[PDB]
Amino acid sequence: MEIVEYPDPILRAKNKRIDIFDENLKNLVDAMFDVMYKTDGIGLSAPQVGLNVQLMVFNPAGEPGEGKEIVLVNPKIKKYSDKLVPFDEGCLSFPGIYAEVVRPQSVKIDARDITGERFSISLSRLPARIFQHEYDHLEGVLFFDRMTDQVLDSIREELEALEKKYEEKTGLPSPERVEA
Numbered sequence: 692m693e694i695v696e697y698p699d700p701i702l703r704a705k706n707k708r709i710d711i712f713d714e715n716l717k718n719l720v721d722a723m724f725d726v727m728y729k730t731d732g733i734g735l736s737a738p739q740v741g742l743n744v745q746l747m748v749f750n751p752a753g754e755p756g757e758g759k760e761i762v763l764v765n766p767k768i769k770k771y772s773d774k775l776v777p778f779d780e781g782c783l784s785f786p787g788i789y790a791e792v793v794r795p796q797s798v799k800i801d802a803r804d805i806t807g808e809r810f811s812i813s814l815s816r817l818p819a820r821i822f823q824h825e826y827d828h829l830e831g832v833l834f835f836d837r838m839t840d841q842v843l844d845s846i847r848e849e850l851e852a853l854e855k856k857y858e859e860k861t862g863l864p865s866p867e868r869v870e871a
């Protein structure tokens with residue numbers, strides 16, 4: 692069973708609206724949470740497990756029997772804060788790579804829950820940091836796309852190692868290259 696790693700194109704592909712809110716959905720959500728707990732993550736998005744659908748799960752505590760198991764399908768940011776804050780992010784699709792990303796502090800979101808119920812929440816602190824990370828995923832935006840040029844530099848070679856890994860595995864050239 693498998694986390695999709697950069698530079699896999701799955702991570703860049705358009706993700707479908709979810710229309711159907713059934714048990715398969717609940718089983719998917721549940722697989723995702725368990726992937727998160729196994730890999731010590733604090734969120735996951737559907738493309739990261741091979742599925743180009745608009746679905747994210749997160750839990751800010753990142754620990755069993757802690758925090759909240761938050762689910763969001765078909766979300767859309769209605770607004771970002773003006774205030775920006777730094778935070779060191781890693782990503783399960785880029786194993787071992789950690790670097791500063793600056794993002795809005797809070798967001799207003801419109802999203803659906805696991806049954807189909809549309810709602811409207813605000814987020815700040817870690818929940819908004821995780822959300823935005825995962826929402827980028829839903830839009831085929833990766834964390835290094837959001838990194839300043841000096842920060843991207845410090846991880847270039849680490850990204851290329853992932854590029855190489857994918858080339859060695861597939862026999863194909865990487866479909867994208869941080870050298871940009």
Ligand SMILES: CCCCC[C@H](CC(=O)NO)C(=O)N[C@H](C(=O)N1CCC[C@H]1CO)C(C)C
Binds near residue numbers: 753784
């Ligand atoms: C920070 C914003 C949300 C991060 C989400 C990722 C998981 C992921 O890639 N989701 O798309 C994660 O859990 N990353 C972890 C991460 O960045 N963490 C773990 C808790 C604190 C923070 C490191 O500052 C580790 C696994 C790299």
Ligand SMILES: [Zn+2]
Binds near residue numbers: 721722725
């Ligand atoms: Zn489970």
Ligand SMILES: [Zn+2]
Binds near residue numbers: 725
């Ligand atoms: Zn579980």
Ligand SMILES: [Zn+2]
Binds near residue numbers: 731753754
């Ligand atoms: Zn832990």
Ligand SMILES: [Zn+2]
Binds near residue numbers: 781784828
């Ligand atoms: Zn990620």
Ligand SMILES: [Zn+2]
Binds near residue numbers: 851870
């Ligand atoms: Zn190079």
